[PDB]
Subunit: 328 residues, 3 copies
């Protein structure tokens, strides 16, 4: 099992990931990240070539979405169904109507008797952690109020690694430069992907309009990670409030969502970027990216969204399998 | 493969043509495609009535997106997918505005179509379905929109008729089908769609309505051009009546529409129109012996419960037929390939 | 071949009788059918706790119709169908009036039953379930209605009891089970249903309630006629208390009910110290105050196992009604 230059011992990494709960991106170590990246790639190729995808038959999951949150929920459903497993849904409900005079711990202790695993989206942070403590079965966090969204970070990382595979090498001569653009204060997807990218040889351009800057405790978490692998320097973190400077010499531009510009992306504002730059956005997009950019080959935000299917298939396969592997 | 015992269906070739086809309007189905649908529907009807293996399409994952409540069509599409042995994720009980929460229809469909092999979409907006089709990398079946496009209702309507009157397929100048459309012909879009499809054949039409709720001119024009084009138009081709006693005479089919009180000024107008067009065993005594009664449902008072025991009533068979017709259409579009041994064949 | 310790089960014969049966009330289950359910439930419990293949009912497509919020029962029936290897479409987020949008219950059920092999139906109206059964070409499982019929709640309650006290099946005049029902005995319909089923056996009852919320006479009468039928009725058979201290003495089972206060009877480790060693505590759930979280660590608490058992009991009932099967070798036998 190879992804160019690293052999992955998938048997051994699955033994370790079996019945693992995934709440935060920090619950995924280096070895587990390689296994996910590798397996995601196998599912991408199997599905793009119309091959049998049914690597996880015989499982029954529960999907609990207590805010309307249709793309992430459908992505998890499709992944389960394409793997050949089954799922029952709780949707179109909020906290109060689902927990109708019942504790979170009662609800999860009972629900986990019915199913092999639970996928849970709840805008409360407390609820996901209470569910994990109460559940006899593994939980995948599909997004909560603390800004934990592990599968968004994983699919973001998979997407980058697909155009810039050298991010995995921890090579002091091969650095990736990324610009994060928009609302860096409220854009939790930046916070989570930053922590994961900072384990690697990466330098960051934070591009925001003063009022919406990256929070200090993320800058600190980036600086501790980069220091730990001896890739911190005074040039590791740069701050801009304009595109013209922010977007210069970055392999990746990652746009965030807003609501109420310095930061609208046009073919014009992209003429002076590297020819290899790729554009991500977790979606949905509003004005941050003009429709004309969809025809620009630097745009990969729809491939990115597509990649969430393969990454969620991979993560469900590695946690829930009982045991050959997807290959080719 | 034979239909009517006259017309040979090369299902391999017709599948190659229908593969990854979107079905939005009944005019997206040609003569050959309609034969393959009718034939395949009949095989699913017999396999299921005999408790045989129905799993002729197993490895597919669909998304079903219903942005207005419409329980029977949605459940019928679910059942069809599941009976074929495929899988479906559902968006229900939601409207346009809450599902498109500050996202364009084009963004939503471009992404959703990466997840799945095909989409079933019901939206009361007509624009939305056409935008979905333009944005989607995967086929769409329109399960109903605001323009009155509802191709699987028309298809299951036609399947039902063809089961009692198979000669409608022959385009034989000696073998004419006579149908009465009864009730709200202005707002009954199922009449509009079925009319267009029937007018490809040797058919004459009785439009039975009171003044205010008559068939629109643009449908009469489309029926008249279709009948002319196959040299079946005469001054007899389209008649208009305001009462059952005349309207229901010498028709093979009576097709009753919904007369929703919210289409009148008040109750007195409703209950006058109601009552004038209500179907009883009495109002059916001077129809042909062979007359069959359709209604797209749901039923309110348009038809009295006593008529359910009358052998001329088939509106519950009609609704059941939607399962077989939706199984057929899904099989023909989404199969990756054929053998002659992979086809349903009772 | 099919044994339940010392009851031999003729599953072929009992399935011939249960095939395409509708189950609306606990009285639609006779002695033989109850043994088939108990036996099949036990096989599913062991297969699933040992991670074996559970797919004993492939190729069916069900419709599950929930016209009130009723999340646990609905998820339990979904899980059961999916674990058996069959498929389901769901109608939820609906009440009576919005689902029957100017359509009769009989029209809706006549049509829906053409699509599917079976229907699971929860509706707070009692009329609706009985009209559904009259109109349907396919079998219905009642998942709960307004008359307090909830057959799979009673069945999973009974399965739970029989697991700790298997002698309830023997109808042995020397082996009596003592149960206390605690809380709102007037509105607690699962007491009503389980009482009727327990009273087919050698059972005595402690009804513990204030005064305003006492067991209704019609249930006392139905318990007395059942117990008389097997000559287990005596003036000792039914006792009435207004306090836990007396009510809870010498009972093998304590069954706590929901009381939505729309204080006397909260269960604590303290109020449990002088119960039998062997007493088990049920509660149909959800619980609010009736049982303190401290009791969850008490080994007498089984209300979470009880709720888990609903999976195995719903798998069993679906298998026994819907199987297309003939042969003794196809049945689960851990
Ligand atoms: C994290 C991801 C993107 C996977 O989660 C979803 O997609 N769910 C969500 S949270 C959301 C939102 C918007 C405003 C305020 C608060 C939350 C957008 C949405 C969302 O789904 N599209 C909004 C409208 C829409 C729904 C589905 C498809 C297309 C458009
Ligand atoms: Na599903």
């Amino acid at each position: 099992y190879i992804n160019s230059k690293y052999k992955i011992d998938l048997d051994k990494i699955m033994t370790k990931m079996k019945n693992k709960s995934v709440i935060n991106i920090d619950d995924v170590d280096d070895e587990e990240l390689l296994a996910i990246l590798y397996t995601s790639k196998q599912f991408e190729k199997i599905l793009k070539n119309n091959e049998d995808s049914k690597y996880l038959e015989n499982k029954v999951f529960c999907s609990v979405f207590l805010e309307p949150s249709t793309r992430t929920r459908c992505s998890f459903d499709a992944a389960i169904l394409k793997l050949g497993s089954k799922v029952l849904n709780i949707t179109d409900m909020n906290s109060t109507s689902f927990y109708k005079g019942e504790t979170v711990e009662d609800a999860f202790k009972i629900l986990s008797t019915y199913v092999d695993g639970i996928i849970y989206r709840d805008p409360s942070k407390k609820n996901v952690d209470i569910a994990v403590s109460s559940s006899s079965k593994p939980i995948i966090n599909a997004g909560n109020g603390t800004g934990e969204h592990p599968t968004q970070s994983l699919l973001d990382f998979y997407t980058i690694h697909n155009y810039f595979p050298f991010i995995l090498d921890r090579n002091i001569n091969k650095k990736l430069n990324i610009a994060f653009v928009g609302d860096l204060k409220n854009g939790r997807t930046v916070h989570s992907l930053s922590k994961l990218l900072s384990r690697y040889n990466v330098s960051f351009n934070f591009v925001s309009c003063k009022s919406l800057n990256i929070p200090k405790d993320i800058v600190n978490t980036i600086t501790y990670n980069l220091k730990k692998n001896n890739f911190y320097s005074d040039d590791s973190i740069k701050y801009f409030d304009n595109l013209e400077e922010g977007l210069e010499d970055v392999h990746i531009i990652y746009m965030t969502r807003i609501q109420k510009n310095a930061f609208i992306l046009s073919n014009k504002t992209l003429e002076n970027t590297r020819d290899d730059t790729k554009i991500l956005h977790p979606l949905p997009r509003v004005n941050e990216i003009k429709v004309e950019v969809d025809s620009n080959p630097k745009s990969v935000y729809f491939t990115q969204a597509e990649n969430g299917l393969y990454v969620r298939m991979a993560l469900l396969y590695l946690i829930f399998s009982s045991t050959s592997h997807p290959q080719f």
